[PDB]
Design a protein around this ligand. Sequence first.
Ligand SMILES: C[S@@+](CC[C@H](N)C(=O)[O-])C[C@H]1O[C@@H](n2cnc3c(N)ncnc32)[C@H](O)[C@@H]1O
Ligand SMILES: C[S@@+](CC[C@H](N)C(=O)[O-])C[C@H]1O[C@@H](n2cnc3c(N)ncnc32)[C@H](O)[C@@H]1O
Ligand SMILES: C[S@@+](CC[C@H](N)C(=O)[O-])C[C@H]1O[C@@H](n2cnc3c(N)ncnc32)[C@H](O)[C@@H]1O
Ligand SMILES: *C(=O)CCCC[C@@H](S)CC
Ligand SMILES: *C(=O)CCCC[C@@H](S)CC
Ligand SMILES: *C(=O)CCCC[C@@H](S)CC
Ligand code: SF4
Ligand code: SF4
Ligand code: SF4
Lengths: 17, 124, 126, 305, 292, 301
Amino acid sequence: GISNFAQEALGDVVSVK
Amino acid sequence: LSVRKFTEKHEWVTTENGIGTVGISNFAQEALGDVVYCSLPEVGTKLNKQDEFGALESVKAASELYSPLSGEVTEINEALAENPGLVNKSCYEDGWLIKMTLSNPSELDELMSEEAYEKYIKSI
Amino acid sequence: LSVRKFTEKHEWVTTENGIGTVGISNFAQEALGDVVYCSLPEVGTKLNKQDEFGALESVKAASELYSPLSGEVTEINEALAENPGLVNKSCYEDGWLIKMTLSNPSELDELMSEEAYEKYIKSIEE
Amino acid sequence: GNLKRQKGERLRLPPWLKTEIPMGKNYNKLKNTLRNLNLHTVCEEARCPNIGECWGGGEYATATATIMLMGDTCTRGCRFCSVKTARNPPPLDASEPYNTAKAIAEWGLDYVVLTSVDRDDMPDGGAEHIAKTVSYLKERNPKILVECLTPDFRGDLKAIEKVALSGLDVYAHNVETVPELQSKVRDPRANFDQSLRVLKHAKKVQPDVISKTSIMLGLGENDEQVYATMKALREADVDCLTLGQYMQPTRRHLKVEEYITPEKFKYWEKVGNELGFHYTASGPLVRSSYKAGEFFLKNLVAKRK
Amino acid sequence: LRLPPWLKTEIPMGKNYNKLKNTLRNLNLHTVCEEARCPNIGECWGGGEYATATATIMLMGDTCTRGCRFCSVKTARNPPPLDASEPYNTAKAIAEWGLDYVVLTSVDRDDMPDGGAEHIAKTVSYLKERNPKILVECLTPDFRGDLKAIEKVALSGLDVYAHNVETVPELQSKVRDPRANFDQSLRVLKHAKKVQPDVISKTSIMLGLGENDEQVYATMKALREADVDCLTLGQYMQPTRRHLKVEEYITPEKFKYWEKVGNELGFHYTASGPLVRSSYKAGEFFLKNLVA
Amino acid sequence: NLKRQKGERLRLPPWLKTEIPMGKNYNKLKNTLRNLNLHTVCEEARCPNIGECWGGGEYATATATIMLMGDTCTRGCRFCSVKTARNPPPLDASEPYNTAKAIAEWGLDYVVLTSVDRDDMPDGGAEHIAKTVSYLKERNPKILVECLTPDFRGDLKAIEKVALSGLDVYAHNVETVPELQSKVRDPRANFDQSLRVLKHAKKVQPDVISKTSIMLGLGENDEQVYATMKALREADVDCLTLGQYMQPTRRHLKVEEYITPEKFKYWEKVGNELGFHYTASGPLVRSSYKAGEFFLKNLVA
Ligand SMILES: C[S@@+](CC[C@H](N)C(=O)[O-])C[C@H]1O[C@@H](n2cnc3c(N)ncnc32)[C@H](O)[C@@H]1O
Ligand SMILES: C[S@@+](CC[C@H](N)C(=O)[O-])C[C@H]1O[C@@H](n2cnc3c(N)ncnc32)[C@H](O)[C@@H]1O
Ligand SMILES: C[S@@+](CC[C@H](N)C(=O)[O-])C[C@H]1O[C@@H](n2cnc3c(N)ncnc32)[C@H](O)[C@@H]1O
Ligand SMILES: *C(=O)CCCC[C@@H](S)CC
Ligand SMILES: *C(=O)CCCC[C@@H](S)CC
Ligand SMILES: *C(=O)CCCC[C@@H](S)CC
Ligand code: SF4
Ligand code: SF4
Ligand code: SF4
């Protein structure tokens, strides 16, 4: 998967920007 | 992996499972500048020691690469084609040049150790 | 007795029965002048490539001697003790310097031939 | 090869511009001298290709380097110069002029070239700092020959006068390029007319000094602009001239627009002789400080007439 | 639903970056980079080769009194009160980071009587009194057209007064909060030139919100009639699923086209690009076009 | 151990060792001489500075001292390795013309000319030397010419023949102190005659620059060297050169003492006190050693 630290600073996968 | 050994042409080599990874030292990349094109050989090219296998071209300088070992080119760093700055940014990790076999592994005794190379570039 | 090969320091060498005879070229003795003393090593001295084994002294010049090969010194020319001029009058025959064994017989590949040394001292484009 | 840049694309380096990676005893002797005295050189900061040749010396050639005064960070941002940029660099090191004389004394130089960054934050542009370095050099060795590659000082006549009265032997200031390319190549605080007023005023203050300037080729200029520039330099009573190939120092600086052939540089030296320069150092790797002491003998020949 | 290739970025690396991240939390300061979720966080907070690591401290909390449809900053009817230590702490962190050029911003505080003009002015005064040679740029809110509040910020020793029109006039109602309009944002930049004649004006517009080439040209020409000095053009990117969708990804070639048109109209420097934001390399553009 | 005994010869000091001459500029200059049948005092006197002088610096510095009137001298100086014969061949009329070609081919701004002595010639070759200077100033009026002439046995007409040839530096060597003239130089030369050559050169051409050279290490003492430098400065000699005598062949004079480099730098200080326009002093310093550099760095200002 993806790291929680990275996920919280990743965005919204649709990332969004 | 093994320890890094250098040649007088400022090229290092590390061996692992009979495969040698070749690149240029940090002292050489700082002296060349921003590398913009990596002329690398093709996979399968037979190389002898001190044979010219390619060249590095920077914005203000250019350097011809000479082979530190004798063997057959196994792999080249394809990432250098689209991002040749890896030679300057990560000359010891992500900016390796080629990987080859060792048709004469006794040639590693001719290269300088990492301590010997540091004295070689500083004239001490 | 094979052909002689030269170095970049103007040192020639011939081989016979695994023994190398060393001296300086005619281009070097003309540039040094009348030799008055020859500093030569003693027998049994082990030498490496490009090691200062001796030195020549002339009236107006002085040049160090570097071994063109690696090995052990076998014999030095005793005639140079009382006749140091043999280096000038006969650098390729009776004016040889030392005789030594060969640790690496493949070190002859590094040197020049009679033609290459002539292009080297005359700066001929090749 | 191509030798002329197509749009979007960039040029391959010609073989006559390839140099050797600098190293050796004299290279490290100069390196250790600079680091022990917190000194800088334009050779390192501008990333000159002649470092190995100048710092290495030779059998009879002396190892030399052009010390850069007032720090390694300039106030100008010239698109051709890899020297770092900041609006307010740290204050001047008061010991640098004194330490510079100690560095030259170690190197045993008979001819010394000095330069510096531009310090637009300084009221006098560092003119007193440069003149103090020349003083310590003449103090340590009265028989020394000093050349100053000097900034334009934004045309400040008192600043130019302070450097030209320091006991200087050669007053050097570079126009870098033809007038039509001043805005593209140089910082907007520099222009062609201003650089000629620097060289013209140095001769007015001290007529015995030598005027010297340099031009970079390969930035897009044509032969008409080069000759017109050289003609204007002579009318400003500039004694000698240097022409060289511009070479891209880093990826972020200007790309080379054309690589001038070695024969074409030989022609520009011919024009320099026709126009009456004392000498015209013209060549691909020729820089302002390249063998400056060797070319200084040409000034003494023309001065004798 | 479109996803472009030239708008991709990297996950922040923390070589010189955690120094800024830990300094902002030590002084309990906020920044617009984290709240707006900018993709250029790694490039602005960490210089790759030789770029001074800069940031944009967002003042007056992380919650705005306005809800702009293009902005992901939190919105509340009544945000927490002002922190008196914010102007003083900001001056310390900026001088700590070794910046020669800093740009400050803040959320809109329509609950404050002056809109925070005195709070911003104290942040600039503490920063200029500490370091007179540092360059400060304020991305000021419109203050609902309060000419006294605009005058208070413009007279705080400001180097570059910045207030953005964000988009073309035809898209003001859909993109921005109704308390902000096009003619109001122009009166913020115009009045800063009257009270402080030697100030430098700067604004930023966003592309991809449904505007056309004809509408963009009239906006830049109207900005020049307002004697606005600088201009910034960038591609609008959707912050969260809840905000507006992108309408058209402007090509990088057309982004370069508006840079020439800005140079034609007389803009002192026109910074245009897909990833170009208001403060993106603001100090680098100042050194290349605004010092003679 | 720098002092010499009768039965012993001195050891060569390390500061006098040079390198074997070779390279591009060395072979370029040597090929030019052989194609024009020219000679140089560098090769005939076997100078240890051949590699440095003929090497140059790759711009306008590859230089050499051409020796006119053949490689055979009519005199036998006990310090000079130039060949000696009673009847040398006649002069080559094309030597002045070919010498100007060689100098123009080298692109020199300062050229030094010298020659063997031709005591068989009625004028000692003065016209031949003057004709070489005229050819040089014809191809290049800007060039600076220094002539290291013989004494002409004091012939005033031969001395002024060279002095009025458009010369820039008139050089004639006293070689040693007056007490060692008989031991070192040919009996046809003496100290007072060498000073007459320099005095008469300035007398007929006041704008000329006088120059002379002395060899140290032939048995002279500090009291004689200081007195010789006074007599030279009294004779209005502008420039002085001090260098270490070095044995050219076994058949020539042995070095009596190898003077230290610090002592040479002291004699340079003495030359400045006495008023010489410059004083080139050093172990390997010869009359032509960097002559152009010493001329431009001292006499132009
Ligand atoms: C430090 S500048 C000295 C002049 C002074 N600082 C000024 O601009 O007024 C040193 C010189 O290096 C030269 N230089 C810098 N980058 C160069 C390049 N890429 N190619 C050729 N010359 C370069 C320029 O001629 C410049 O004048
Ligand atoms: C948050 S505002 C701060 C100033 C004040 N709060 C105001 O808007 O008047 C600062 C900048 O963030 C930018 N911003 C926020 N979200 C953005 C997005 N999704 N794309 C591009 N820019 C954005 C806007 O361009 C705006 O100029
Ligand atoms: C060029 S001729 C002198 C000119 C002319 N033939 C005459 O004697 O009047 C010889 C020159 O070489 C120099 N020379 C010859 N042998 C030398 C030696 N062994 N050591 C130092 N100088 C020497 C002499 O000082 C002299 O200047
Ligand atoms: C690149 O060519 C930089 C050249 C710097 C020239 C300095 S070393 C002397 C003026
Ligand atoms: C996403 O595009 C948000 C961009 C925020 C830009 C800030 S960091 C400077 C104006
Ligand atoms: C040995 O010392 C011979 C020196 C010859 C000097 C010539 S090259 C100039 C006078
Ligand atoms: S003024 Fe221009 S050329 Fe000189 S150091 Fe500064 S940037 Fe380089
Ligand atoms: S005013 Fe609009 S853009 Fe600015 S912080 Fe508030 S909601 Fe975001
Ligand atoms: S005169 Fe004496 S010093 Fe001159 S060339 Fe003849 S022998 Fe040599």
